[PDB]
């Protein structure tokens, strides 16, 4: 945002005094703007909203539709789960719930786990979901044809380092640099 500094500088035409630009403005006229209804092609349901546009671009298209990209999701209903997307600890219900939720939260694993329903299904950590998603993607790749454990070691190493009591933090960090 800012750090409490001078105000922004904005474009202006009527610097000087509209005696300079009297001619440059009088000789031209504006393109007629209109409040026009539009429907974004990115909308699965064809709802319509208003906004200001030039009345020569009316109803053309919504430039932000190109931001509507989505990441893929695997598919299985009756037999692909048993044949290819096999599992022995996760039910079809839990896998489908996790997959729909991952689409909800666009494979943002942390908030995915945050939502992961702990009372419709048994508890588990983020890296379990991450590695299971990797496994399902690998299986899909095979039919359609770095290490989670070290990440757990990560979480525990950071937890130990930070939970370290302040005096030990200072002493060890001294010991850290001395050698």
């Amino acid at each position: 945002s800012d750090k409490k500094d001078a105000p922004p500088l904005l474009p202006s035409d009527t610097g000087q005094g509209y005696r300079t630009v009297k001619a440059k403005l009088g000789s031209k006229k504006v393109r007629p703007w209109k409040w026009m209804p539009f429907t974004n092609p990115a909308r699965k349901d064809g709802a319509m909203f208003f906004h200001w546009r030039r009345a020569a671009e009316e109803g053309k298209d919504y430039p932000f539709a190109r931001f509507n990209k989505t990441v893929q999701v695997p598919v299985y209903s009756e037999q692909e789960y048993q044949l290819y997307l096999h599992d022995d600890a996760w039910t079809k219900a839990e896998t489908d719930h996790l997959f729909d939720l991952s689409r909800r939260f666009d494979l943002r694993f942390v908030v995915i786990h945050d939502r992961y329903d702990h009372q419709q299904f048994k508890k588990r950590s983020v890296e379990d979901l991450k590695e299971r998603y990797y496994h399902i993607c690998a299986k899909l790749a095979n039919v359609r044809a770095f290490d989670a454990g070290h990440e757990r070691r990560r979480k525990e190493q950071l937890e130990r380092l930070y939970n370290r009591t302040p005096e030990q933090v200072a002493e060890e960090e001294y010991l850290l640099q001395e050698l």
Binding site: S1, P7, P8
Partner: protein
């Protein structure tokens, strides 16, 4: 940034308006004083 620009612009504009009013009042006071001194100098020129 727009809020910052608007606060700074309102400050500058209101303070320029206050400046306009103060300069105007000082100009009227100076005009009265100058008229008094001009009449005094005309009196001095005639007496002289």
């Amino acid at each position: 940034q727009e809020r910052r620009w608007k606060v700074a612009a309102a400050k500058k504009l209101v303070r320029t308006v206050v400046r306009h009013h103060e300069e105007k009042q000082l100009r009227e006071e100076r005009g009265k004083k100058e008229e008094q001194s001009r009449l005094r100098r005309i009196a001095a020129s005639t007496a002289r």
